[PDB]
Amino acid sequence: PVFPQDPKWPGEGSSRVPFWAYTREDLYKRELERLFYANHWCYVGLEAEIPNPGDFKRTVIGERSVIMVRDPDGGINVVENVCAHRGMRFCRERHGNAKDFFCPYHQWNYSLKGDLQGVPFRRGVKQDGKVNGGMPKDFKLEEHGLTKLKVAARGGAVFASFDHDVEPFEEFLGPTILHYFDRVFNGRKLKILGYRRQRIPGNWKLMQENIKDPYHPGLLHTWFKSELKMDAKFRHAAMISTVNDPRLLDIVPEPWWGGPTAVMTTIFPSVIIQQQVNSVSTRHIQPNGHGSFDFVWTHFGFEDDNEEWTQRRLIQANLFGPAGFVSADDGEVIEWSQEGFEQKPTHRTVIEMGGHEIGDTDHMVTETLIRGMYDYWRKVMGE
Amino acid sequence: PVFPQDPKWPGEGSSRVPFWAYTREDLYKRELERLFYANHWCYVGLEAEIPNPGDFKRTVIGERSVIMVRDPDGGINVVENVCAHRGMRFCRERHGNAKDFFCPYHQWNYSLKGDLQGVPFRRGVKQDGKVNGGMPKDFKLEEHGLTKLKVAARGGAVFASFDHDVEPFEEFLGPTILHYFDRVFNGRKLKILGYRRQRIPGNWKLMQENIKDPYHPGLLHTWFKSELKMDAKFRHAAMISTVNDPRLLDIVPEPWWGGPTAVMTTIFPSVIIQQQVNSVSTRHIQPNGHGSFDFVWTHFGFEDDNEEWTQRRLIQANLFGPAGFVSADDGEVIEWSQEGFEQKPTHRTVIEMGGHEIGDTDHMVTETLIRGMYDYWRKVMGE
Amino acid sequence: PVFPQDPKWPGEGSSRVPFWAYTREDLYKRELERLFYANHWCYVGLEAEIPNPGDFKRTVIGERSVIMVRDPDGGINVVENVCAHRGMRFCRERHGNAKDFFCPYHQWNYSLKGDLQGVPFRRGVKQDGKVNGGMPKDFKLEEHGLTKLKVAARGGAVFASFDHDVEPFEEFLGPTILHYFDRVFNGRKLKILGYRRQRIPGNWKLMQENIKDPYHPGLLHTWFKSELKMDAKFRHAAMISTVNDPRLLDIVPEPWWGGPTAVMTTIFPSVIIQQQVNSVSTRHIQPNGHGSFDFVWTHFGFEDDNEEWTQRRLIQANLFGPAGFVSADDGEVIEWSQEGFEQKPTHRTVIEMGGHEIGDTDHMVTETLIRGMYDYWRKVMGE
Amino acid sequence: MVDFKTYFELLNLYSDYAMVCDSANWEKWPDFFIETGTYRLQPRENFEQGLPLCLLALESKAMIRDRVYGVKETMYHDPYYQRHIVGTPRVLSVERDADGERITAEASYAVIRTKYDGDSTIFNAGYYRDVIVRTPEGLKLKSRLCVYDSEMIPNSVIYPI
Amino acid sequence: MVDFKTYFELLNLYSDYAMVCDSANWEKWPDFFIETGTYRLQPRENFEQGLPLCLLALESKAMIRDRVYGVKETMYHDPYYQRHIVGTPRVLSVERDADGERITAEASYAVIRTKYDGDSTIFNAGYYRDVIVRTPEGLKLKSRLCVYDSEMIPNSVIYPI
Amino acid sequence: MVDFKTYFELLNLYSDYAMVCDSANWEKWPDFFIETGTYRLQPRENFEQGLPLCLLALESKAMIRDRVYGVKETMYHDPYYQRHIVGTPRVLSVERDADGERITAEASYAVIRTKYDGDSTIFNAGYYRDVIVRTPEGLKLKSRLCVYDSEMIPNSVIYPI
Numbered sequence A, B, C: 001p002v003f004p005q006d007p008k009w010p011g012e013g014s015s016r017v018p019f020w021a022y023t024r025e026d027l028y029k030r031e032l033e034r035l036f037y038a039n040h041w042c043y044v045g046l047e048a049e050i051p052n053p054g055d056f057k058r059t060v061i062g063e064r065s066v067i068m069v070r071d072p073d074g075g076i077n078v079v080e081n082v083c084a085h086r087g088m089r090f091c092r093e094r095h096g097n098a099k100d101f102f103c104p105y106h107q108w109n110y111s112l113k114g115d116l117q118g119v120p121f122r123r124g125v126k127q128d129g130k131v132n133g134g135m136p137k138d139f140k141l142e143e144h145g146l147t148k149l150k151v152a153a154r155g156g157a158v159f160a161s162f163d164h165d166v167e168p169f170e171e172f173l174g175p176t177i178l179h180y181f182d183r184v185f186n187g188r189k190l191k192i193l194g195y196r197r198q199r200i201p202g203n204w205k206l207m208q209e210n211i212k213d214p215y216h217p218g219l220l221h222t223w224f225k226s227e228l229k230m231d232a233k234f235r236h237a238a239m240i241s242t243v244n245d246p247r248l249l250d251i252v253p254e255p256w257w258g259g260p261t262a263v264m265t266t267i268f269p270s271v272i273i274q275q276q277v278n279s280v281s282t283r284h285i286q287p288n289g290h291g292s293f294d295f296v297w298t299h300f301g302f303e304d305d306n307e308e309w310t311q312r313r314l315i316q317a318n319l320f321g322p323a324g325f326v327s328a329d330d331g332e333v334i335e336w337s338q339e340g341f342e343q344k345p346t347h348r349t350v351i352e353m354g355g356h357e358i359g360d361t362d363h364m365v366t367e368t369l370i371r372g373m374y375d376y377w378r379k380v381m382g383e
Numbered sequence D, E, F: 001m002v003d004f005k006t007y008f009e010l011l012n013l014y015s016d017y018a019m020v021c022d023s024a025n026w027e028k029w030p031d032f033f034i035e036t037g038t039y040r041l042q043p044r045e046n047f048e049q050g051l052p053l054c055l056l057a058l059e060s061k062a063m064i065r066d067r068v069y070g071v072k073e074t075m076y077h078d079p080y081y082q083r084h085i086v087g088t089p090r091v092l093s094v095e096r097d098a099d100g101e102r103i104t105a106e107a108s109y110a111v112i113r114t115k116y117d118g119d120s121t122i123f124n125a126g127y128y129r130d131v132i133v134r135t136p137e138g139l140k141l142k143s144r145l146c147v148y149d150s151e152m153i154p155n156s157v158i159y160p161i
């Protein structure tokens, strides 16, 4: 029986993940409902991407286009890129500077906070000698602005959420994972070094798994003191660890680290924060169906970086991204795993390294972060 | 709750269209069943496209390939492009001239009316000295012809319908829509100027809306006394209204207008008749799933046109079509609306301009034609 | 009613195949479960493709990637190309030479028979000075090897099956069809001439039909004493029958035929064995959804062939393959038939040539092989 | 038929046109034409059947400037990158009148479109049929005809082909 | 290695072949070969592994004529446009016998197919490996080998590659 | 600006680079560069905005050799065919110092990927921006910049573009 019928998870615990957890579109739509559109903070960008008032950057949450714009007061608004009249996705550029949002189908104008400021022909058109058209006078702009999202900005990073009753960002991450978040985003002003983008034909969860997988780097990436910590709900995680042209390494330790040499922090479900040697990046997951996701790397540095340090970060970025000596393996194996899952969706994986227990460890020889991820997955999705 | 579960239309009336009306494929299949394959005349072409006997043009109705051929007697037959033996779509050319239709898989020959005239080895094969094979003596040619369609030709335009108990074309359009139809197709013989084709990734209804939208042109198309009329069931509609190289306008009024300056006539669900300034065209909707449709512009002139008038039409076609100064906006906004709809299919549009009434108006400041369209939609599909 | 709703087969017998037999994806997945993954031997290749130990060829059964490798002992193993840890499809090359299979995500090592030989850190890693991680000690390698398939090799051809309780290959083919199988694969060692590949966008069954269609070749391929036999269950079949550059024919009879000049043998559901004049090939069906299939021609000769006979086979191959004078028509009509079926999936084909009888005939003028195919189809699929 | 200097300038003309209309300086498109030059972009079905309708017919350098202005300031469109891959050009003829010489040349082209975060697709493919003349500013187009195979347009053609 | 006139004629040969086999005059395809010329269209997997089988092997101008006739009158096929985009050719060698000079050259190609109302797709991509000789009618192909990357053929190859 | 011999060698350089990086001999990729040559592969969005990040920045022939070794021996990747279609190159400038002459040239490119049994797709499209110098071994790249439109990478870029 290769294709499932009324599937049920193989028992309790999470030491065996069924293949259909990656191949079912109904499960994926429920994932969009419960992990991206409710009860979660999802990454929308960096403050440096929108330094001045009016600066906006288009991005995504789950599969919903949103706009992150800097308000004239200095705050950050996040609105849904869908108009109130007839649902047109009106914002087409990736970035720019606008005093207001506007949809040109019928030229509805909204403030930078999403408030409907103008509707052409709202009170009608008097011609000779009649007033024609107009909106029904019960309709007022207060109720037909852009869907607004709540915003959490911290350390230079910007998250947002459709759910307005979501726990505060700090309580969302928990103390231990928030320590490493702040460890990279330590209050300095960041400078954007650039973007890389890749479309990976696998289930989005496989990327979280890949950055919740601590012992694959020593076995997969042939271009090569650890501890793994989690938040209360096992959703977020932190992995802590201590050639012809010498410039291709030229690794110089940095004081702000300040003792772990590498930390890979997965903030569920939307983002990875990478600190590897001297390269520092965010990795944004943007799902597209159950079997594909886009992956956007924002590589950045700090303002106190001189030009030598900028060159250091840039050259070491050659190890990561869609072409890196290390990172291409990840997309490749994620695609191949998805092919395997689709091949026999009734089967199951075995994530049993380090036992079946879920908890923070002081070694890297365990799949406990994935076991915790799928404990949380079963709880949130009722599977 | 972003994705619908057994959704119901937001109340009665038709002033708010739910997003899932554009995003549901089961709804689209029902649309094909009840609006394209039943109870409707659908556009299949122009008589000038098949002037001589044997001249055929392949086209589509909904998603069903058909062939429109001029009969040796002078009439017009329309048959389904599916063979009776094993259903092969045998006609591959767009146009040509055939003495008869034939499928080459087993060389079944059909008259130009669709009647099965030949089946190789139908009566068997005499060999030595026994007859071998042949069709069962229950098999009769009369029962395995091409699916024949009802054909309606008027003013030079040709519609067809799979439903043979469909109301006559004149009663199908009603007096007013038939009046504007005849205003464009006034009995003169037409000259094909050419074809333009564009694939628009949006729901097909969005095109009808776009030409049942009277006040979007004055707000969307940045390249610049009206009335809107409808048929009995609110399905068809008529919108009536009164640079470096000067040739790009040179607009000259024509007597056949003769009072109105522009009329855009939507014949539901398949065609638009465009009379704009000096450009005259048909715009054929050919759907492909709920989220895409092909759009074929047949630009034509009249036989009495000299070469001055032929250029008037040719140069003014620079304003329309997939690259026109005016028409590209339409496909763009339709695609963007579809993206918005797919983003949050539980939401709803607000088509309240001009109030909530459905009826013929004497101004352009209302969305009443869309309200009538979706009144008819809810009636035909029971939602 | 153009689209089916709770469809039921049109009556009894199998002289009318409904269009939805080719357009339904649930039916296609059931076809994969019951015709490709159970109770059937499916073609995986030729022994000559893997002469030496370690030589492997990657191929497919239904939609499941498998690997056919020659064992160090001289036998042939066939294993599923899916890893046991997290289901990664690990074999990426089409062919090559391997000491063992291995997945590089976490470097699991398997024998060429599929047995899990190595798991890094299975037993843990003692660092300083605690042993950390490892697999639970109830975990046994014996239970997490590659899914092994049963293998049947004969005459140089190699079939495989996931079902290990499958009837023997000889009883699978039956005496009559095994006679022609052995007639082509008569024990001589084969030399591979090469591969041709084509993606045909039609339902895979249409290919079987096409080589169970005896009277189309004289009517479709205009580049032109018979008998056709079937096995007990009507699934397999054998069709037997007796220019500027002259080299494009140069047909020379060869003694091993001997007496039939052409034999087309369909082994359900996966392969065709073609003997046409002096060209001999296998044609492998590799389905991909209900509406497409890949088609791989392996053209081969025999070891005793000189340099004259090799070039003869090569030059005569210009009639077959995706560009052949004869074979391109087949893919074309299969695609067009699929289009027709999708156009009106409630309709039905008429395969009534030669009556309603299912049985071996002494002429080509019958559709009895297709009627038997669909008798078997209805029985296995419960329709 | 042409000397090396003219051949060099001709290949450079084809390449310049392609790469300039892919860049942020695409508004300099009209400069590849003489003042009376024409630009027609026509489907293969219209061209082969003798139907005179084009997708776009700019019958003077002035009308080409009009088109540039319309695209730049009066048309709402999805932004996208486009990339002309122009095949090896071929020279068909050189003729002579009192203005000077005319060169007739052809080249197949493939315009590859990339919307902002999308796959690169064959947007529009066809061939150029050009009459090329020499002006004090170099080789320029007297007439450019773009017969395109990609009749089913991916929704809209905005930037120069 | 070659003088300017020969280089001009060479690029014209590549471009002429491409554009003629995309046009309504594709039947003139055999005219690019000498009477003993060969045309082989072979998958990359067969070529790199030393497997002699081609997708199509026409071992003389006569067999090419055979293919042209078969395609035009004996093969039921979906009509389609095809568009050759031939990359910049490269000249590898010039050799000499009493027969004359032979020029060896290569060029990558991408053939784009457009079915009647469909998207433009990469039908067949690979490269040419040619031996070119000079005849009184100009440069002609003595042998043309098309090693194609697009092994999974989109259903059928009808018109010349 | 350039004489015929140099133009011939330049078109040959573009074609050689393209076809060698499509062949089994792609490891000879560093041989197109001088010892101090650079290779940058950069998204259009970073380039146009002055953002210094590339997809790949090899700042010496030695780093290019590093990349070749890493690709050939240390990276697990899906094997694939790739086919460079390089449009007609354009020569922009020739400049002179005490080292000698530098030629600046550009060419649009389309890289077509074919996974083993898959369709041929537009993997990566953009343009080359080159500074070319003459060495005793022929024309070589001093710097090559590939500004690519195909920002949404189809999962991974392994072989040279």
Ligand code: FES
Pocket (backbone or CB within 6 Å): A083, A084, A085, A086, A087, A088, A090, A103, A104, A105, A106, A107, A108
């Ligand atoms: S749809 Fe946004 S303004 Fe009409």
Ligand code: FES
Pocket (backbone or CB within 6 Å): B083, B084, B085, B086, B087, B088, B090, B103, B104, B105, B106, B107, B108
């Ligand atoms: S299917 Fe039309 S002839 Fe057999």
Ligand code: FES
Pocket (backbone or CB within 6 Å): C083, C084, C085, C086, C087, C088, C090, C103, C104, C105, C106, C107, C108
């Ligand atoms: S999947 Fe093969 S080792 Fe982890």
Ligand SMILES: [Fe+3]
Pocket (backbone or CB within 6 Å): A210, A216, A217, A221, A326, A330
């Ligand atoms: Fe990794």
Ligand SMILES: [Fe+3]
Pocket (backbone or CB within 6 Å): B210, B216, B217, B220, B221, B326, B330
């Ligand atoms: Fe409009």
Ligand SMILES: [Fe+3]
Pocket (backbone or CB within 6 Å): C210, C216, C217, C220, C221, C326, C330
């Ligand atoms: Fe056949």
